[PDB]
Design a protein around this ligand. Sequence first.
Ligand SMILES: O=c1ccn([C@H]2C[C@H](O)[C@@H](COP(=O)(O)NP(=O)(O)OP(=O)(O)O)O2)c(=O)[nH]1
Ligand SMILES: O=c1ccn([C@H]2C[C@H](O)[C@@H](COP(=O)(O)NP(=O)(O)OP(=O)(O)O)O2)c(=O)[nH]1
Ligand SMILES: O=c1ccn([C@H]2C[C@H](O)[C@@H](COP(=O)(O)NP(=O)(O)OP(=O)(O)O)O2)c(=O)[nH]1
Ligand SMILES: [Mg+2]
Ligand SMILES: [Mg+2]
Ligand SMILES: [Mg+2]
Lengths: 153, 153, 153
Amino acid sequence: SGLVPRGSHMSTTLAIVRLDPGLPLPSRAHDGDAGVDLYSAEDVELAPGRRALVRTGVAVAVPFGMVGLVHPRSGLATRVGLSIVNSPGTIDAGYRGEIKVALINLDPAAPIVVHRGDRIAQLLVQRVELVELVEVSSFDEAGLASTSRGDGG
Amino acid sequence: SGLVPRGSHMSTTLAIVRLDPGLPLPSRAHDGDAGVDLYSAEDVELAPGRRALVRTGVAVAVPFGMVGLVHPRSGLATRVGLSIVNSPGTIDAGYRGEIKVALINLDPAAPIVVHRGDRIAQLLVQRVELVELVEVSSFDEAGLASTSRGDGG
Amino acid sequence: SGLVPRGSHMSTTLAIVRLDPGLPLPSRAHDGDAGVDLYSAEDVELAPGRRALVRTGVAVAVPFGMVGLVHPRSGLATRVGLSIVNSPGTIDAGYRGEIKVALINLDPAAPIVVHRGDRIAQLLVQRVELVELVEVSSFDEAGLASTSRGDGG
Ligand SMILES: O=c1ccn([C@H]2C[C@H](O)[C@@H](COP(=O)(O)NP(=O)(O)OP(=O)(O)O)O2)c(=O)[nH]1
Ligand SMILES: O=c1ccn([C@H]2C[C@H](O)[C@@H](COP(=O)(O)NP(=O)(O)OP(=O)(O)O)O2)c(=O)[nH]1
Ligand SMILES: O=c1ccn([C@H]2C[C@H](O)[C@@H](COP(=O)(O)NP(=O)(O)OP(=O)(O)O)O2)c(=O)[nH]1
Ligand SMILES: [Mg+2]
Ligand SMILES: [Mg+2]
Ligand SMILES: [Mg+2]
């Protein structure tokens, strides 16, 4: 329906330009899914170990105070070793260019064929803290020293 | 204590089924830690460059409006080159199956042995924006054109 | 200005120690950007397939209820195959040590040279749900069974 539901009265609008209108709008595969699936605008073959920067045919306007995040899909990751070099890719609120996906073939022997119209990644949108750094001479200064860890990870 | 603290009165409940009750419940290694560590239910050896889909023995119910995120652990990543092909793995609110982790050995020469009961990943839970896409013919239309970047990244 | 703006009255402070004060404070490359870029404190050469744990010269105090996330930069990922083994790296609220970045060269043939003072990663800060796990015998118990997916992903 065109009626915005009760709880979800503050659902976030994402403006999108289909730079390649031959591709469907990105969509959630199932209700409640965190991401919308991005399509490839191109046919690409990746030999083992090779990477490509693949156009998705879309540009978005992530709201200020938020971030878009490009995540790999789990099925292709396991079945053929498809990954994303810079995962999770960070799409900034001021970016108005085309979203591109840095696919890489992490299989040792079998090439990966991507066809135009395949779903090759997923886009999440989340709030981000735009932090103000405060340089301190030590954490005790800031009142932040004794912790559950310390300088240990 | 069983008393929910002052500030943290709205702590998020995560329902979990131990499909493999021989494994401990996932836990935070230290107070304030972002994730709970996931266990492997199986023994697995990964030769250099090989990947596996590893059962964790748990199923969860991420709340609607949230997402579960499967992240690698830093120590194994550096010491032996252990990574996750689809990192960060995206666990959707409607998913009720077993959480699986797509481990991969990014070392060139040394095999990685995973034992049942090892902590092989960490699970974070975060809010996500379930966005409504609005297709526009250009960002100016939406009142969103002139930015700190432009189509540049 | 020193005046905190209207909307952004609740901007998050991140205390930071420059363990290596010869490096600039991390900064956002453009307004609205989700992350601040982390510098390398060292010169490092990565042969194809090799990884290193690289010091960034900073320690931070992520607030309780938040997480720091270390993400790769897209340009180096595509141009030279630079990635991060444990991406996204998880920086916990109680951590007070130096932030380190697990760089890896995913190119098959060309070495990557990192110079002291190069920007080698980006740090985001986000809220995280510090969840309370509730073990249930099945999701129906919790009132959470019938979904848009089921045990299917
Ligand atoms: O990219 C990273 C990730 C982690 N770290 C630090 C901060 C984090 O709080 C700490 C622990 O991270 P992990 O939980 O990913 N590592 P692991 O589980 O191996 O070790 P620990 O026992 O300390 O949790 O390591 C970094 O410096 N860089
Ligand atoms: O997966 C991605 C990541 C980034 N991008 C675009 C959007 C983002 O806002 C822009 C910059 O991303 P990075 O900061 O990760 N890249 P880098 O730091 O190399 O370049 P810049 O100088 O533009 O920040 O690149 C994509 O199209 N796909
Ligand atoms: O690391 C992960 C990622 C996903 N999953 C499960 C939960 C998630 O909700 C489900 C689907 O994840 P993806 O969307 O990344 N996979 P894909 O798009 O290939 O399949 P689907 O058609 O089910 O969306 O797979 C895991 O068990 N581990
Ligand atoms: Mg999917
Ligand atoms: Mg840990
Ligand atoms: Mg950048």
